[PDB]
Amino acid sequence: MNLPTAQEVQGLMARYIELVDVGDIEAIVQMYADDATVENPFGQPPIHGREQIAAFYRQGLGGGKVRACLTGPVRASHNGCGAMPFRVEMVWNGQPCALDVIDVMRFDEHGRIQTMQAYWSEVNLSV
Amino acid sequence: MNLPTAQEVQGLMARYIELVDVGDIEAIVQMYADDATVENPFGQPPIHGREQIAAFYRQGLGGGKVRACLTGPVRASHNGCGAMPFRVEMVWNGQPCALDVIDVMRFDEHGRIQTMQAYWSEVNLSV
User: Fold this and answer.
1) HEC readout, chain B
2) Where is the active site (chains A, B)?
3) Which of A26, A54, A75, A86 has its CA 20 to 30 A from that of B97?
4) Residue B102: which of A10, A43, A102 has the nearest Cβ?
5) Given B42, B78, B122, which is nearest A43 (Cβ)?
């Protein structure tokens, strides 16, 4: 595809959450541009490229039974960007915890995630 | 105050929504840095400075009985930034419409909004 329309952004960002929810690391990595930048959480140094992104997601979505779901609609722009609210459920010290997150994404002219910023901090975690 | 902590960002961004909800234009303008940039919707040219921001808000929050409420928690960073989901209710052609929005804000070292980006498009409007 080309630079995603607002409707296409909604579709792509919702698909991303579906992939996080099932934990398909390889499928998530393929949604990213080969040289994408990820800031997660926003405020920490960016990581870069699909190798680093794969390592990041495998560490995050490997062991525990992670779930993820949108908690409101995707807000999309007309310049290939969007933002969405979601909740991530994960098991910590064998305790179920939930994390509220907002992801902002910019897509490239091929429909892959060029940049993403994940807004959250410890205030957004519930043990 | 100084560069807002994550907790302070949550407070400030929630206060902003409260001010939009009551429609206190002057109070909203004072939350912004004197030279702040606003992109609303994200994708359109930025406006700059409190005069332009006051004009923007007066046009948006003047006539109709606008309401606004958070539709999830504020996601705050440790570098003075945050993101929040909310819904704006407004009257269009005398028809009540609702707009789902995510605002991303960066605060300056005095606790004022330096930049803000409002993510939404027509897909997010309900007439």
Assistant:
1) CCCCCHHHHHHHHHHHHHHHHHCCHHHHHHHEEEEEEEECCECECCEEHHHHHHHHHHHHHCCCCCEEEECCCCEECCCCEEEEEEEEEEEECCEEEEEEEEEEEEECCCCCEEEEEEECCHHHEEC
2) 16, 40
3) A86
4) A102
5) B78
The minimal CB distance from A100 to the residues B6, B73, B119 is found for B73
CA-based max dimension of chain A: 43
Cβ separation of B72 and A73 shorter than 8 Å?
Answer: no
Domains recognised in chain B with CATH numbers: 1-127 (3.10.450.50)
Mark residue A93 as left, alpha or beta (left: phi above 0; alpha: psi -120 to 50; beta: remaining). Answer: left
Other residues' Cβ atoms within 10 Å of the Cβ of residue B7: 13
Using the 8-state DSSP alphabet, how is residue A123 labeled? G
Cross-chain residue pair A81–B43, CB shorter than 8 Å: yes
**Three-class DSSP category at A46:** coil
The structure tokens listed for B101 are 């929005």
How was this entry determined?
A: X-ray
Chain B contact for A43 (CB, 8 A cutoff): yes
